[PDB]
Amino acid sequence: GTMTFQFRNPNFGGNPNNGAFLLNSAQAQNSYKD
Amino acid sequence: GTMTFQFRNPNFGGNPNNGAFLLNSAQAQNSYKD
Amino acid sequence: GTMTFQFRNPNFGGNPNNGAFLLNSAQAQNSYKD
Amino acid sequence: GTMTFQFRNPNFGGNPNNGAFLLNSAQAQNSYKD
Amino acid sequence: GTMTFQFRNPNFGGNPNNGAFLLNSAQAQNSYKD
Amino acid sequence: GTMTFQFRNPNFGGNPNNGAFLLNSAQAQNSYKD
Amino acid sequence: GTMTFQFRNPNFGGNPNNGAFLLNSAQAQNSYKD
Amino acid sequence: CLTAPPKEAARPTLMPRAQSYKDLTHLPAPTGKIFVSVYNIQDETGQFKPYPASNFSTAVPQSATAMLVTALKDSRWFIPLERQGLQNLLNERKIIRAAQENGTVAINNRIPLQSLTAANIMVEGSIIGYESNVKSGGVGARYFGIGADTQYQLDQIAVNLRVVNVSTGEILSSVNTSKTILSYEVQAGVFRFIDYQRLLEGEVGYTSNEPVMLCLMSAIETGVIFLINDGIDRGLWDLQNKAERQNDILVKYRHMS
Amino acid sequence: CLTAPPKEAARPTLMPRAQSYKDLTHLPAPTGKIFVSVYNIQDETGQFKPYPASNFSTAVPQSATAMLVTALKDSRWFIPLERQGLQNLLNERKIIRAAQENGTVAINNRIPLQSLTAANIMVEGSIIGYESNVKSGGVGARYFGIGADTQYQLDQIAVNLRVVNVSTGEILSSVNTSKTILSYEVQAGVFRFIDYQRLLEGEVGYTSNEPVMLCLMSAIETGVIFLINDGIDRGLWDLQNKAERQNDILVKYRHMS
Amino acid sequence: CLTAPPKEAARPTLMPRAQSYKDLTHLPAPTGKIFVSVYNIQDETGQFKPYPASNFSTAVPQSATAMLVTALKDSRWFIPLERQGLQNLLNERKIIRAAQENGTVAINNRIPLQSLTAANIMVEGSIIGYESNVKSGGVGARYFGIGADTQYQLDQIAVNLRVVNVSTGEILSSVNTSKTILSYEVQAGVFRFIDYQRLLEGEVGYTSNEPVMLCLMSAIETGVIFLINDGIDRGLWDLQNKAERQNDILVKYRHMS
Amino acid sequence: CLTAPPKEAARPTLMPRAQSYKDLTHLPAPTGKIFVSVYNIQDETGQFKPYPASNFSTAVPQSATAMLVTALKDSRWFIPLERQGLQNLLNERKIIRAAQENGTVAINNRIPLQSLTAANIMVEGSIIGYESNVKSGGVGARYFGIGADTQYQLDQIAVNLRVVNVSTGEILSSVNTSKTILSYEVQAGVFRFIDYQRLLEGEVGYTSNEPVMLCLMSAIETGVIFLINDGIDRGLWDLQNKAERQNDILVKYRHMS
Amino acid sequence: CLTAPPKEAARPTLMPRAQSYKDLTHLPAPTGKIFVSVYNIQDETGQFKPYPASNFSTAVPQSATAMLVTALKDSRWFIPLERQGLQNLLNERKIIRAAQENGTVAINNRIPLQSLTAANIMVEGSIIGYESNVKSGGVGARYFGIGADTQYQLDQIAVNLRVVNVSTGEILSSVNTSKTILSYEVQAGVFRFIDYQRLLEGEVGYTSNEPVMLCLMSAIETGVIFLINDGIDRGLWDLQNKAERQNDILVKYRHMS
Amino acid sequence: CLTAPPKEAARPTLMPRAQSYKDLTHLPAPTGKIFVSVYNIQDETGQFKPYPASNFSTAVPQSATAMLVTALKDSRWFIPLERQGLQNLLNERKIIRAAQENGTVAINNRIPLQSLTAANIMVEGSIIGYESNVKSGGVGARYFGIGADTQYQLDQIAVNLRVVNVSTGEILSSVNTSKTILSYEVQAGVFRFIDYQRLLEGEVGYTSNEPVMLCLMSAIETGVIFLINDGIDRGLWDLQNKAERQNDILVKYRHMS
Amino acid sequence: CLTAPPKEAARPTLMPRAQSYKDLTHLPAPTGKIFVSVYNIQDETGQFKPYPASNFSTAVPQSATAMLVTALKDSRWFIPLERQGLQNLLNERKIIRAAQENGTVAINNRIPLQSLTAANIMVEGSIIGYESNVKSGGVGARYFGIGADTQYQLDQIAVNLRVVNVSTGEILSSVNTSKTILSYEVQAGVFRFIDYQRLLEGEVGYTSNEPVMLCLMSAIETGVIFLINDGIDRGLWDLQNKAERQNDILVKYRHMS
């Protein structure tokens, strides 16, 4: 059917139930300190 | 279709399921102390 | 369309899924002690 | 439209998704001890 | 309209999203020990 | 019926209620350090 | 009625509200170390 | 056993009538009961019950024209012709004729049709509105553990009754009576620990949604009293004993206007 | 007991009328009441109530043509013919004839039909719109524990009334009257600890949604006053005493235009 | 008490008219008012209100043909025949005839039917569209604790009016007027701790959704002015005083085209 | 006060026309304007608006046949007969006749019906499709705190216009014009701490959904220009001055094909 | 300002035609164009769009019979009679007659009706199916932070065209042409920390749902080419120059079968 | 640009036919093609697509009677009369007559109607059922990080075809052919850390829902072959060369029974 | 490629018939096949499929009267007249007559209509019920990691067949046959760690919902056998060889009663 495109990020993208994972998928990847 | 615009922030913007991430996406970015 | 106005605060405002963030958006801003 | 009035408290008021905040909005205000 | 009465407690009362608060609204009031 | 295909990952795949498990199904499998 | 078959696992199976338990039903069974 | 259908709870008494009925039945008798003709007190309110009630469940019943008839019949003032389901009456008269137009029916059980007794006036009407939650409310306070609340709503239902003179077609009187259905709810719940680990929870509830049909019946009975007063006032259906012009009841509903 | 149906709360009084009614009833009497003919003040608003109300519950009632009749009848200016449910009236006249066209009806209760009294004008109309939340609002502040709020909405309902001259078919006057239904809500709730572990919560609420039927009734009554003024102005239904041209009421609604 | 229905808030004044009405009423008088005939300015927009409004609640009202009549009647330029609910008018004339075709009606109140006055033109039309959120927007900034926002939407409603010449059936003029309904909302909320454990929260709100019926009324009034200009321009309904050809108003709407 | 209905925002100007209108109005004048007959440019698209819009809200309006008429009337090339709501026109002519078939109408205001002017061609048509999100998109990047995005969708609407020759019934020309409704949205939000515990959040938004009615109007205007070109090309409605065959506009739409 | 309706984005060009059109227009000219008659290429697919689209939004448009006409008209092979909205054509001819059956119409603008030109064949048809997601897919990989994906669906739409010989009623040829609507989507998003606490998130998206109306138009154009080939093959509408039997195009669509 | 509608993906080829078509086309030629008459192979399945598809989207298309015609036409065995949309054919013949019953049509393009060629048999039918998920399934295993799955469903569609002898009204043969639509899905996803904090996630997907229209077309083609066999067997439409009684194809479908 | 529509999975064989068919086909031949007339075995079950299936998807198909015909035709006992879609048959006979009532049809292909062969009995019927989940169930056990389950439901479908004697109108026999559709599901999933951090998850599934159309076909075939037995028993359609009265099959279905 039609592909009603929609961002994946919660910010500037609407669907908020995705915020818990996305940010957690970056603190878990954060290889930086100081 | 019509783009019924709506804020992304929970405060002054309605959709509350976004509050858990947004604020957490700022405590994780908070590079300030004292 | 019509803008069915509704408070943002959970207390005296209905939408309760916003309570977790609002209060947390104030303990994180609380610069007071004693 | 009609304003179908409804309490804000979860107890004696129905909407239960508001219980997490209300009580937390009182432990955070509790200035008493002993 | 008709007032379809319904208990407030989750046990013997159905609406389960109220269990988190009610019990927490009693551990926070528990002034007993031993 | 028709198989409306949809990704399983929350990122680039939409369904966000799957983010809590997927990432947790990788931190639990993470056999790396340093 | 018709039995619209659907996997039980959240990954490759869709229903994501099952991810919290399944993985937890394996860390609780994990009898391995090192 | 377990498989027997439930046994009956209450005695199916007469429909409970409000004060307005015991206020309507005791009216002064007129010179002569008037043949009246009520066709259809339709449901002009255009309101359907909100969630969770089904979409099609009309707010106020389509009962009226079966409650207005009872109202008129009760006061010893009107004799209500049918004129509602009249087509069934005409079918039954067609059958009476086709059954005794041979004269062969037994001389005992032959029904002497006269002609459809026709009425001098006609009480048309409507349910001109049923607004929900015109005035909500409700207070609830809860101390340590113990708590108690209250809610109440008013549903206002208005009814219009027009006595149209069938001779000249014009309207003689038209009254608008309102009623405020009251729907309230009370609860009291105790959820405090009483001992170290003995949680005593309890809860008592109660709720009363005044039935819309009974409020509509009281509204229509008051409407009938107002019709009888607006008639007695000017020109129509004068009383049997003019001394009862200042009756206890006909002065109560005379001053409400 | 517990199984008795609820007892009745309030007395089904007359429908509460706004100021515009006590402003309409006291109009100067004309030379002679005019036969008027109101057929159908239809529901042209095309609006249905939002959630949670059922999908089909019309926003404003289909009441009108039963409230406009009362409006016209109230002011001592118009005599409203039925012309609504006219088919029932014609059935009842058909029955009167078929009941006394044999002359055998008892000389007492025979109804002398004259002919359908016909009206010189015709007050057509419409509910030209019911917009919801034209202007919302509401302030709420909550200090430590104690809190209080407020909300209010306006639902604007507009009504159009056209006095069409039945002789020549043209329209003589056409008025548009608006009304602003006010629906507000107040709450005040206390949720602060008062002691170490004694949580005092309490909450009082209240809400008033002005009923749409009463606002529509007031709008139609004002519309009727404007019709009477637009007539008295130019050519129609001149007053009994021309000195009352500057009446207290006919100068209020004369200057609103 | 608590059980009385709510008391009335505002005075049901005349419908608030935009500038275009006080711009339309003051038009130069023509030689003679033209009989006009408006049948049905239907709802060609095919749009229904979004959630939460009911599925069937039409976006723009079916009001038109009851607002265009008022528009035409207001400017001293057209005399609007009914032609809408004409069937009711013909029923009332049927009744007038059947009531005085015996000559027995009282010589005072007999209605001299002439014939249905017929109009030289016919103003057909449509609501050619109601698009929602043609242009949304809204800024909101919130510093420490204090915050304030704003939203606004435009709903564009377009109306088409065609003056068709009834003699030869062809169209003389056709105008398209748009209007931009503005629906905005403002809030300001304070949620900062002021003391160690004294949380001061507060919030003020406001919202204005310009009513669709009033915007449609202004659109139709401008459409009527454009019709009068497109006529005055070429061949039709020339003014009484040709010097007023360059009137202050007839030059404003002449240059908008 | 608070209870006054909202005041009007913008001036209800003429409907904003695209370039294609100022491109259509300036066409070379033909020998003589052609009587044209447009019956129903129906809504063959069979598309309804998605969520949250109501289920029944048609995607493109049923406006057409009221916008094509304006298109034809605007270019000084066609004189559009009504033929839409023709039944109302025939009722008004029936009334004109029944009003002056006695000759007793005042010699001034008698309407000389000639006969329904009939048109040489007929511009049938359709909205052959409205596809939603034919091509979506949108980029959004957000650095530390500050972020900004964009979205855009295209809704393609196609319109078919067929000039059928009414004499012989065959089709002379048939054009398909498309239009791409553009609906875009921009936001920019700042959610970074600026101090130790001073959270500065802010957000500005904007959105423009080009109205479907205006895109349809531009599509139909281009369709009309293509009809005029496909006619001028072969055999029909030759221009007044053949030198204008290579007009600036008639060469632009001649090469688009 | 903010209250002006949105300005127009793109130029409403002709409907973009696929290769099959520039493949259809360049067909060898026949001996003589054939009068063809297309009544209703109905929507036999019985498919409606899934969520979130409204329940009633038909999957493929009801456009056809307005796109098949254009297809036939484009190739210089058929002259399409109307036969669709024929009732409007017959009303306009009724009006032409009733307008010039007095001979009083001006000798210039009188329309010489001949008779409804009747066609030798009739191209009936159907949209025999629109299946959604006949073949989905889509790969997406995401390394540390950076990620990119893709999705694509095929919606297969099949169209049947039957050239029925109107003389003897039998079918001469029947072709089934399919088309695969392609709807794909691409995204690329970056959500990696770049510094200690500087989160750089960004995301670009794009999506193309090929419009169903254009795919249907290409399917129908190919169907028309196949009809012309199946005719040229056996007995019907032989070409003007038999040497063009092996034309570049008539050999491409001859071998697809 | 960004505002151009999407470009076309695939070439709209002929509808892909299964083996049963290349198995049906190569049948032995009979003595003479039989005129056949197929009226309506209706949708007797009474099944609509589940969620998320719209409520009204019929499971199997209403295509049939436009696919059975193609089936019959393809095998060189039947000549299918229209008899579907026959009313359009009769309108076109009415127009042919009314166009040449004056003899004034040009001697070249006059259509010699013979009479509606009538067929010796009639192939009625139905889609006697479309059951969804008659047999689901699907295995999926996922080791550390890497995982892969599979799903598949069968939707069984059955079709009934009855060759009724139109002379005597009785049924000659009746066949039931089933088809198993296969809808499967494959995925493979990798979600394992590859380094300390470098998460490599990736996922490839694919899905094929065999289109219901193509399965129905294959079912109907097999049904036609079975009809031809059940005829060739006993008494009807004997082959041209009896030696081909044991043809390679007529022995395959002879033994399936 | 990726854009080709899916290729076909299985061969569209004959509809799989249960044991009852191979039990029905091998019945003893009667003296002579009886002309039978089956009009409409309607869907009296009044059941629609639950969620997620669409609201309108009937539980059992409307197939019957196209499966009962096949049942009767299969057993060499009845010759089924059409009588279903009879109106199409009568249209085709009307066309045969209107095509050869001039005698000008070619002497070869002229269809000698005899008259509608009329049947001696009539097999009316119904689907008297389809109850869902008459008996659910399902066991599932899961040890450490490994787990396996099972579910099964029965949907009982009952069918009634009445052989009504068309001569005298009375019913000769009436049989009720039930069938238990079985819908079961099996899964087995492994979700145990096998190493320190190597999670092996896997899962195999399977499901079989016996198609309702096949169960209905078997129910109707058994119903036909019971009809043939109830006839052979008393008076009707006696066998060819009375020795086969105790046939292996006619004793199986004789003792089931």
Numbering used by the authors:
A (entry chain f), B (entry chain h), C (entry chain e), D (entry chain b), E (entry chain a), F (entry chain d), ...: 21 to 54
H (entry chain A), I (entry chain B), J (entry chain E), K (entry chain H), L (entry chain F), M (entry chain D), ...: 16 to 272
List sentences quoted exactly from the publication behind this structure.
Curli are functional amyloids that play critical roles in biofilm formation and adhesion in many Enterobacteriaceae. Two outer membrane proteins, CsgG and CsgF, form the core apparatus for secretion and assembly of the curli structural subunits. In this work, we show that CsgF forms a stable complex with CsgG via a 1:1 stoichiometry by lining the extracellularly faced lumen of the nonameric CsgG channel via its N-terminal 27 residues, creating a secretion channel with 2 constriction regions for curli subunit secretion. The free C-terminal domain of CsgF recruits and binds the secreted nucleator CsgB, creating a growth point for further addition of CsgA subunits.
To obtain the structure of the CsgG-CsgF complex, the full-length E. coli csgG and csgF genes were co-expressed in E. coli strain BL21 (DE3), and the purified CsgG-CsgF complex was applied to the glow-discharged GIG R1/1(Cu) grid for cryo-EM specimen preparation. We collected cryo-EM images for the sample, and cryo-EM structure determination using multiple rounds of three-dimensional (3D) classification and refinement resulted in a density map with an overall resolution of 3.6 Å (S1A, S1B). Overall, the structure of the CsgG-CsgF complex reveals that CsgF forms a 1:1 stable complex with CsgG via its N-terminus (residues 20–53 of the full-length CsgF), yet its C-terminus including residues 54–138 is invisible in the map due to flexibility. The nonameric CsgG structure in the CsgG-CsgF complex is almost identical to the crystal structure of the nonameric CsgG with a root-mean-square deviation (RMSD) of approximately 0.5 Å for all 1,854 aligned Cα atoms. By contrast, the visible CsgG-bound CsgF fragment adopts a loop-helix-loop conformation, distinct from its nuclear magnetic resonance (NMR) structure but consistent with the result of secondary structural prediction. Strikingly, the nonameric CsgG-CsgF complex forms a secretion pore with 2 constriction regions. In addition to the constriction region that is lined with 3 stacked 9-residue rings consisting of either Tyr66, Asn70, or Phe71 of CsgG, the CsgG-bound CsgF adds another constriction region to the CsgG channel. This pore eyelet is formed by 9 Asn36 residues, contributed by each CsgF molecule, with a diameter of approximately 14.8 Å. From the structure of the CsgG-CsgF complex and the isolated CsgF NMR structure, we learned that the orientation between the N-terminus and the C-terminal domain of CsgF is not conformationally fixed, which made the C-terminus of CsgF invisible in the cryo-EM structure.
